[PDB]
Amino acid sequence: SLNNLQNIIYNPVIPFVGTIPDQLDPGTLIVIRGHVPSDADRFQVDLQNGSSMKPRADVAFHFNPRFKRAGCIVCNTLINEKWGREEITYDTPFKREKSFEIVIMVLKDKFQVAVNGKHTLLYGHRIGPEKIDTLGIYGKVNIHSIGFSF
Ligand SMILES: OC[C@H]1O[C@@H](O[C@H]2[C@H](O)[C@@H](O)[C@H](O)O[C@@H]2CO)[C@H](O)[C@@H](O)[C@H]1O
Ligand code: NA
Numbered sequence: 001s002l003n004n005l006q007n008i009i010y011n012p013v014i015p016f017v018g019t020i021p022d023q024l025d026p027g028t029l030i031v032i033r034g035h036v037p038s039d040a041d042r043f044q045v046d047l048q049n050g051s052s053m054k055p056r057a058d059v060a061f062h063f064n065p066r067f068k069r070a071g072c073i074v075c076n077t078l079i080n081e082k083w084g085r086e087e088i089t090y091d092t093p094f095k096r097e098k099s100f101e102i103v104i105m106v107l108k109d110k111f112q113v114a115v116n117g118k119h120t121l122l123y124g125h126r127i128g129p130e131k132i133d134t135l136g137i138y139g140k141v142n143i144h145s146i147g148f149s150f
């Protein structure tokens with residue numbers, strides 16, 4: 001249910017980097033609605049521990065749709081500016097030129113991500129979700145709205 005969703009950011013400039021307004025506890029939703037441009041190669045939604053650029057902030061959850069060939073979604077974690085083991089999902093709902101809704105649900109042990117009302121993937125926590133305070137969106141994507149449900 002999105003009954004408790006509060007959208008707070010509309011049509012942000014990409015790259016977007018913003019502080020998440022509350023702690024990511026179990027049951028929390030992050031809802032991101034947008035559109036993939038016709039020329040898009042990839043974009044990413046990063047749940048970060050902070051906004052440092054140099055050195056680069058750890059990314060607890062990197063969610064990275066890629067559009068070349070058949071398309072896929074790569075998920076990973078960045079710690080100390082280095083990527084870990086990739087989890088690749090080949091069954092991807094994203095398409096160039098199409099609007100989407102991403103719902104990231106925070107659970108005790110993992111994130112559960114649904115796109116366009118359908119389950120897409122799970123990602124086990126590698127960094128405690130209490131350490132996530134920043135949402136970054138980068139790459140070739142247009143974002144209509146960002147909201148949270150706590
Ligand atoms: O793992 C997420 C991370 O991937 C990087 O690209 C990888 C690539 O997916 C892999 O196939 C290749 O062998 O090594 C690359 C470098 O680690 C991206 O560069 C990065 O932006 C993230 O998306
Ligand atoms: Na990156």
Ligand SMILES: [Zn+2]
Binds near residue numbers: 034035099144
């Ligand atoms: Zn749209």
